[PDB]
Structure 1
């Protein structure tokens, strides 16, 4: 949105983005923002911004474990 991202989760996973091509994720504060946390995908590529994904998906949940590992 013009000004930033006010609404929780800017985009949803229309494509499947593996933890191989992303380095880390970004957590969405679920207390002040929205009751459900969000997983932001920060890819190795920087052509796009942080893409939010639905973390209830198994693959996103799996990525969390790889991506948290630095």
Structure 2
């Protein structure tokens, strides 16, 4: 899937447990006041994650090898 360019209202109080998160949704827009990523839990939740944190980049790092099916090589 691919998120369009939505936004958020607040930043997660902290990171998330990889055992609960499933995938994020980057939302870089100018009409908004700030820019961050949106993560979601496997239970059906959705929290906005900040890129300044390493759990967004970390998840986003492993998520890139899954979603973006580059190649088997």
Q: Which TM class, normalised by the smaller chain length? A: 0.5 to 0.7
Larger Rg: 2
Which structure is higher in RCO with an 8 Å CA cutoff and minimum separation 6? Answer: 1
How many residues are matched?
Answer: 61
The CA RMSD over aligned residues, in Å, is 2.4
Q: What is the CA-CA distance between 1:51 and the residue it aligns to? A: 0.8
- Superimposed CA distance per residue, residues 4-55 of structure 1 (whole angstroms, 9 cap, x where no aligned partner): xxx9423312143033321110110334435x53111111011x3x210111
Contiguous gaps of at least 5 residues in structure 1 = 1-6
Contiguous gaps of at least 5 residues in structure 2 = 1-5, 68-73
TM-score of the aligned structures, taking structure 1 as reference length:
0.62
TM-score of the aligned structures, taking structure 2 as reference length:
0.60
